[PDB]
């Protein structure tokens, strides 16, 4: 039986998000997670932007930690799960992107910090930020 894990969704919750005082360009890595049957990945968020261009934004990235071959091609979608558990503020890679070991792809301006704070009741229940990343692996 020749099989492959072609799709997977990773949910990541960052507690006491308001306590995350990392400055522009500082990052928060999630633990590394694998997809199955080979590939290792992790998420990276910049609470206060990666750079000036994104100073008022939270930056979100998908990193390919390891792959058996030279590269991996994949489509991805990032979103936030709200208080009611529903998806919101979704952004998706239009096409698939070419990942290689140690390289990431994502959105530099995924969502504005002031918006996240203003809607804290809904987007930061108990001051917890829950991120959702759905990936589509098209080539291994």
């Amino acid at each position: 039986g020749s099989g492959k894990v072609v799709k997977f969704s990773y949910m990541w919750t960052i507690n006491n998000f308001s306590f995350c005082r990392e400055e522009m360009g500082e990052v928060i890595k999630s633990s590394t997670f694998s997809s199955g049957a080979k590939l290792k990945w992790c998420l990276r968020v910049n609470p206060k932007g990666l750079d000036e261009e994104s100073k008022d934004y939270l930056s979100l990235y998908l990193l390919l930690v390891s792959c058996p071959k030279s590269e991996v091609r994949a489509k991805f979608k990032f979103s936030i799960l709200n208080a009611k558990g529903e998806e919101t503020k979704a952004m998706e890679s239009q096409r698939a992107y070419r990942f290689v070991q140690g390289k990431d792809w994502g959105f530099k301006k995924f969502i504005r910090r002031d918006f996240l704070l203003d809607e804290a009741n809904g987007l930061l229940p108990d001051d917890k930020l829950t991120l959702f990343c759905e990936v589509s692996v098209v080539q291994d």
Binding site: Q94, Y97, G102, K103, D104, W105, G106, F107
Partner: peptide, 8 residues
């Protein structure tokens, strides 16, 4: 569009 890398 506007998907970018923070590693590369």
């Amino acid at each position: 569009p506007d998907v970018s890398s923070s590693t590369h």
